[PDB]
Each structure stands twice: as C-alpha cells, then as structure tokens.
C-alpha cells in the first residue's frame, strides 16, 4: 500500500466578493487514522479554518460527508468571501498521538484571491 498523500489539485482559486470559494482536497489513504484540518498559512502563526474532529466554523461546509467510512474527499466551501479571506489554504492530515494529534502530511496549498 502506498503512503498517504494529500492532493490539492488547484494552485489558485479566484472568487468574486460575496461568492463561495471551493477548496479541493483528497487524501489517498485512510491510514493512519486521524482528522484533516484546513489552515490559512503555513507558519506557527497559521490560522485554523476547519477541523474535522471538533469546533465551530460557521462559514465552512464540507463538500462530502466526512462520516462515511470510505470518504477521501476533504474539499470545503467557504461562504461570503471577502478580501480578508485572501491567502494560501492548506489541507493537512493529522495522526493520533500522545498527548495530542500530530501533523502527518500537508497538501501543497491553494491560493484564494478575491476580485
């Protein structure tokens, strides 16, 4: 079985102010276990955008149902886009660890810009 990859097929997404951005991501394996999260930015100062495991993210909807057993689609839609949303978004796989979940693989990132 090949190692899990996180595929972000789009380098750049361009969205009219007020519309919805769709940010695509696929994970190629269900192993190792752990949630997918999305961030804007890649620093230690990156901003959390979506966490599969928990949290309230009112403007984010997931394209697929992440509770389905075979799900590999981690694409999200972010609603009511404004210029403050512009930046680079990364879809990131975590594995389980102690004391907590650890980052396992990041996607290559998708630029969101606003027209």
């Amino acid at each position, epitope marked *: 079985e090949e190692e899990l990859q996180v595929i972000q*097929p789009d*380098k*750049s997404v*361009l969205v009219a102010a007020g519309e919805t951005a769709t940010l695509r991501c696929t994970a190629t394996s269900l192993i190792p276990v752990g949630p997918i999260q999305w961030f804007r930015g890649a620093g230690p100062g990156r901003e959390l955008i979506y966490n599969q495991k928990e949290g309230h993210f009112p403007r984010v909807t997931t394209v697929s149902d992440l509770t389905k057993r075979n799900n590999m689609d981690f694409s999200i839609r972010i609603g009511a886009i404004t210029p403050a949303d512009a930046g680079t978004y990364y879809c990131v796989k975590f594995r389980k660890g102690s004391p907590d979940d650890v980052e396992f693989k990041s996607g*290559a*990132g998708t630029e969101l*810009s606003v027209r």
Partner: T-cell receptor
Amino acid sequence: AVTLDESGGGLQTPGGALSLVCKASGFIFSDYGMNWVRQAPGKGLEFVAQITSGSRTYYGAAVKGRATISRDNRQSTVKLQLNNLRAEDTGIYFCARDFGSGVGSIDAW
Amino acid sequence: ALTQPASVSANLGGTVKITCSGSRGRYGWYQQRSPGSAPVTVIYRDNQRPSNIPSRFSSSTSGSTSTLTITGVQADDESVYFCGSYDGSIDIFGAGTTLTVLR
C-alpha cells in the same frame, strides 16, 4: 485574441545563460498562471517552470537550481532565466497560460 | 508519473479512446500535429472543451485516471495527444499517444 509572443531564444553558449520572455495580450494577465514547456528533438513535452497568479514558482527536475521564473503584471510579461546551459536544454520552448491548476489546465500556447 | 499508451488507431468515422493515469489532479489533453509545433488544447481542467474545438472531443476524469474520447474520427485528428496534469506534487506531461487513421 489571446497572444503569447516569445523572444530571447536562438543560439546559446554551452555553460552560458539565457532569458526567455513571453509578452502576453488579450486577457487579464494577472489572473492566470504562466508556464514554460519545452520539447527536445525526438522527445515529448517536458515541463520547465510555472509561476502562479499568486507568484508561487514551480520548476521541473531537469532545470532545478538553474531556472528562475518571474512575472511583471504591469507589462504582461513572464521571464525564464536558465543558467549553466547544456545540450540537454536544446529544444523548442513554449510559453503557456493556465487557469489555476497547473499543466492540466492550459488553454493557450 | 503519467502513463498513456504509445499508439492507438481508428477508422475514419470511428470512435477512439486514449486513457492516461497516475494523477488525481486536473488533466489536460494537448494535440500536436508535428514535433516542435504549438500544441492545441482539446480539453483542459478535466473535462472542458475550448469553444473553437469540435464537439467530437470529450473527456472524463475519475480517481487517478482520465480518458479522452474522439467520436467520429476525422483525418485531421491524426496527431500525438499529450496528457498533462499537476498531481498535487509536480507538473508532468505524459509521453504522448500517436493516433493513426487507418485507410
């Protein structure tokens, strides 16, 4: 009409450097990724470099460390600098525009 | 890496398929009539046909594979067809499939 006009090619010195330039017109230049793709004699298309609308840069394995791609949105140009040229760099180089998903999203050459 | 066959053939007026696999990204299909000449995009961003391209060209993408179909092959469809895709790590072209028109 979309145009992508290339210049800076021709004969080059082994070990030397070149600057290819592509001058675009007929579209909103800053919204597209721009690519350089080449083809050596008797071979297929080979990816060289790309710069996204957000100015992230990507290089093919065969030019890594020798290539620099840049864009100038105000002039609608993209430039490819390639140094320490060798025979394996001989070929036809095409400028190409992409819709944001890299080389699977090229619509004009 | 992207894998596509070296050659395919069809009759004039027939239907032909070319499959490329290896990426879960978006696929483009680029027609080149002779080596060194500008490619012509027949499909890009998976399944989109540029407006000047005849409707006989279509494609599907699913999983890690894409298939170009030409329905009603014409003599001017003879060419090499290159698949291209950014696979979420690198931008790659396949090695090209040559379409021969049988007669």
